[PDB]
């Protein structure tokens, strides 16, 4: 969390709003944190990537993370690392495949993904994207209050001010988390 | 020239139906509940048998909640008709409160020749442990709980709405709402 260029409060509030059916958000935001196996250890690095939802998947923020992280692994000690993502939309199939491929070649990396909104949760291809990541060993969880607050504290230019939840935040969470759980069943 | 459910009921206004069965998962200012029931024999393709529309409010007292009106009506209906197995289906606009759930459960325990399927358009206060528990109380009594999807909304339209020949018109995101609600119901019934 220390020394990213933080995102501004308005960008966060707009892009991490967890209304389940939401139009006019063409942007994906990905905040990531790298740590060692140790939960008593500090963050080693942190990045914020933005990208568009449109199908030049090469520029989806998940793909930018993989490119960044690949280099980061080389330049650091070969050891087990815990990566956490907070992502405003869940990933597309292409990105899931690349992450899956990545996680297969790199078992010293374990990935936890927190998602504000499921992208196209009614469409089978984005449903499969979630299942692809699960099988590759990534956990996926819908963001609830604590994760939004964590993401606010770590990645947003909140200037000491506390996270303020928007209306129906936990209600949206209940719907989305049930839907994620359903999509990952069996 | 054949018998129809719509000839057995006093149909609701299409404006009443669109408003009350809109399946937006988080909806405020909708204090009314509509319950459409149909009674069938063991045969789902059998001729239309009986049907009734009940209305009420979500506020107490529970005694005039449509589910309680149904139970009184149906207790009487069962006496005025031949004894055999019956299957009841409800299309209900909000899911039931705990007091209604407990009363339906006791009814179902005492009349095991009756089974009940409840399709609900929306889960009422699904974030409140009391209304979550109502759902589990009904499931435990053997009621089949499902969320209304397109086919059920259409069937409800055909049978219980004053549509004047006109076809059921889906509102925006009906199937997306369905997915969210059906996952949430499944989760509340399992956990
Ligand atoms: Zn992607
Ligand atoms: Zn009730």
Author numbering:
A (entry chain F): 6 to 138, 143 to 195
B (entry chain A): 1 to 138, 143 to 195
From the paper:
Here, we report the high-resolution (2 Å) crystal structure of a nearly wild-type (WT) A3G-CD1 from rhesus macaque (Macaca mulatta) (rA3G-CD1). We obtained two crystal forms of the rA3G-CD1 protein under different crystallization conditions, and determined the structures to 2 Å (CD1-1) in one crystal form and 2.9 Å (CD1-2) in the other crystal form, each in different space groups and with different crystal packing interactions. However, these two structures are essentially the same, with a Cα r.m.s. deviation of about 0.54 Å, indicating that the structures from the two different crystal forms, including the surface loops, are not affected by different crystal packing or buffer conditions. Therefore, the 2 Å high-resolution structure CD1-1 was used for structural analysis and comparison with other A3s, as similar results were also seen with the 2.9 Å resolution structure CD1-2. The 2 Å crystal structure of rA3G-CD1 indicates that the core structures of both the non-catalytic CD1 and the catalytic domains of A3s are highly conserved, including the Zn-centre conformation, the core β-strands, the N-terminal end of α2 and the orientations of α2–α4. Despite the close similarity of its core structure to other known A3 structures, rA3G-CD1 has a much more pronounced positively charged surface than any other A3. Interestingly, the positively charged residues of rA3G-CD1 are mainly distributed on one side of the molecule that is opposite the C terminus. Three major positively charged patches are formed around β2-loop-3-α2-α3 (Patch 1), loop-1-loop-7-α6 (Patch 2) and N-α1-loop-10 (Patch 3), respectively. The formation of the rA3G-CD1 dimer merges the positively charged patch 2 of the two CD1s and bridges the positively charged patch 1 and patch 3 on the same side of the dimer, generating a wide positively charged surface. In the crystal structure of rA3G-CD1, Y125, K128 and D130 are in close proximity, forming a compact charged interface around residue 128.
APOBEC3s (A3s) are deoxycytidine deaminases that have important roles in mammalian innate immune responses. Members of this family catalyze the conversion of cytosine into uracil on single-stranded DNA (ssDNA) and restrict retroviral replication and endogenous retroelements. Among all the A3s, A3G is most known for being a potent restriction factor against HIV-1. Similar to hA3G-CD1, rA3G-CD1 forms oligomers, binds to ssDNA/RNA strongly, and is catalytically inactive.
